[PDB]
């Protein structure tokens, strides 16, 4: 019996329970965005603004249901409307992580017919983050 650790084991939604994505794996996910005609976009956040929190609720009456701070991250430039080139997306990931090397950065994509984000996963976490475990240190 192995024990899932509650200490410094924070996750990051889709794909965070899998081995970290290789560059070939990231490229495959980008190919999937372009093949489906979805709109790629990059978002980023400093470490203090990366995880869901509650601080604003101090101002509230009884209306905190489904309100969380830090859901919104900051948009890198604009969504890539009309982009059908996967290499162009990869080049923006590089440019974004270069501009903000200490930020969390995620790749998302939008479907404009459903008007919803249709996919999303982390592509960079800061090197100083100590609040996560590698796959093989997740249980003890």
């Amino acid at each position: 019996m192995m024990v899932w650790t509650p200490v410094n084991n924070k996750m990051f939604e889709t794909f965070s329970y899998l081995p970290p994505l290789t560059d070939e794996q990231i490229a495959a996910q980008v190919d999937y965005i372009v093949a489906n005609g979805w709109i790629p976009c990059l978002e980023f956040a400093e470490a203090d603004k990366a995880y869901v929190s509650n601080e604003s609720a101090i101002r509230f009456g009884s209306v905190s249901c489904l309100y969380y701070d830090n859901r919104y991250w900051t948009m890198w430039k604009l969504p890539m409307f009309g982009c059908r080139d996967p290499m162009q997306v990869l080049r923006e990931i590089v440019a974004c992580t270069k501009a903000f090397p200490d930020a969390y950065v995620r790749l998302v994509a939008f479907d404009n017919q459903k008007q919803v984000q249709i996919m999303g996963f982390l592509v960079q976490r800061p090197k100083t983050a100590r609040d996560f475990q590698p796959a093989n240190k997740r249980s003890v």
């Binding site: 192995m2 899932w4 249901c65 489904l66 997740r138």
Partner: protein, 467 residues
């Protein structure tokens, strides 16, 4: 003289069988699978169903002359023989939009299925489909949030949601409930839930549970850094109790409650849906009791109609069946009503049991929930059938893991994410499904432990509700 009052009995077909009628775009349409008694013509049987679900009774009444029967009568406008059946017919009935109370599923059901199923003159009757016109759809508040909004509130994209029902069904204390909830959530499940029959009982009172569950939710959310929720059951014996439970959830600031809409009822459910809209709670709908109504091919109401009824009454999730699990649900039948639950516009398609083109006129979609007798080896098939816009629930498949709830949850989460990644990379889950799972059991000890326990477990039986 013209047409006067003549007392006495005449055939229903003289007034209510109208094969030349061109349906209006505001008419509600019903498709009934009808089995007449011997010596009852199909035309008379269809006319009787039309009549007694709209304006007519068994003998002529004088009061018809004060109104316009042409304007208000239901009309059996088409009768289709059923292939493979000696004595079964699809009778099509059109109802003027004027017959129905705006925003009331209760009233729609009372007319269309109220008395006709008990007529001596038929042996069996089944409502297969309903065409709800946009003009009537627009009179409903509908789902409190719907799929897009739910995903936006939860900040969850790119995969199915994962859940689990706490077990045993009954008999756990409020403190043990919260303990199990916390261990499930912390392992990677997005939601847990009260069992459909967990309301308030001598072994655990509701408000004790809500409090311990809130503690569990917030602990897992702080631990994992992901938004978590637990479908707290607001189902109750009275509207006043139900509302009390919803109010407590609002005051705890938790994201989501549940309702058993058939055993609680449409009048209570609509009220709860409106409360959830006004207070920003997600509403998970359990379909307890549906199979009493929708199992048999010859008699009852097909689930696709009960699913349409729910979308009107209000619900962010509805249970949809698993296809591969312990409870019945044929693949093609299921894919049909999932589209009816989720999509804005569904074209007639009889190979999936869709008798009418249905236009939802932008009423939000309902998240289908796959639940019951499913485990890790079912994952590829589930993701293939449902896609990302679904919640997949594992009660036994989580609490039955040899290492406990958190490893159980992580096994399920690893399975889901591996399948989603494989599909995204262009792999066919219908065929490479076992390979994806095997490669994943080899990588993850938690997943391997689950794979070993449930390897031989399948649910393969003759289907009752066949097309």
């Amino acid at each position: 003289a013209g047409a006067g009052f003549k007392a006495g009995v005449k055939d229903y077909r003289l007034t209510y069988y109208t094969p030349d009628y061109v349906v209006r775009d505001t008419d509600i349409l019903a498709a009934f699978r009808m089995t007449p008694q011997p010596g009852v013509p199909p035309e008379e049987c269809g006319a009787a169903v039309a009549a007694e679900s709209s304006t007519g009774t068994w003998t002529t009444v004088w009061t018809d002359g004060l109104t316009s029967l042409d304007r208000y009568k239901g009309r059996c406008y088409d009768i289709e023989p059923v292939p493979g059946e000696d004595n079964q017919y699809i009778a099509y009935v059109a109802y003027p939009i004027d017959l129905f109370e705006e925003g009331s599923v209760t009233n729609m059901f009372t007319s269309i299925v109220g008395n006709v199923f008990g007529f001596k003159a038929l042996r069996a009757l089944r409502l297969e489909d309903l065409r709800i016109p946009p003009a009537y759809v627009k009179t409903f508040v509908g789902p409190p949030h719907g799929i897009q909004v739910e995903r936006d509130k939860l900040n969850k994209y790119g995969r199915g949601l994962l859940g689990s029902t706490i077990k045993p069904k009954l008999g756990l204390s409020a403190k043990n409930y919260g303990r199990a909830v916390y261990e499930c959530l912390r392992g990677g499940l997005d939601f847990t839930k009260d069992d459909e029959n967990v309301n308030s009982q001598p072994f655990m009172r509701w408000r004790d549970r809500f409090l311990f569950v809130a503690e569990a939710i917030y602990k897992a959310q702080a631990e994992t850094g992901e938004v978590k929720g637990h479908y707290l059951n607001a189902t109750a014996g009275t509207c006043e109790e139900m509302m009390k439970r919803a109010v407590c959830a609002k005051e705890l600031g938790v994201p989501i409650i549940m309702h058993d809409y058939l055993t609680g009822g449409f009048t209570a459910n609509t009220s709860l849906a409106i409360y959830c809209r006004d207070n920003g709670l997600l509403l998970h709908i359990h379909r307890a009791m549906h199979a009493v109504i929708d199992r048999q091919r010859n008699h009852g109401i097909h689930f696709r109609v009960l699913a349409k009824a729910l979308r009107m009454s209000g619900g962010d999730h509805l249970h949809s069946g698993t296809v591969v699990g312990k409870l019945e649900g044929e693949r093609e039948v299921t894919l049909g009503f999932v589209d009816l639950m989720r999509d804005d516009y569904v074209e007639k398609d009889r190979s999936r049991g869709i008798y009418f083109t249905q236009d939802w006129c932008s009423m939000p979609g309902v998240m289908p929930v796959a639940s019951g007798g499913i485990h890790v080896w079912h994952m590829p098939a589930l993701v293939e059938i449902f896609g990302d816009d679904a919640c997949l629930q594992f009660g036994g498949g989580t609490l039955g893991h040899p290492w406990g709830n958190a490893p159980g949850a992580a096994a399920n989460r690893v399975a889901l994410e591996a399948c989603t990644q494989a599909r995204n990379e262009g792999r066919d889950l219908a065929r490479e499904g076992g390979d994806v799972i095997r490669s994943a059991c080899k990588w993850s000890p938690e997943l391997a432990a689950a794979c070993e326990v449930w390897k031989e477990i399948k649910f393969e039986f003759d289907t009752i509700d066949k097309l």
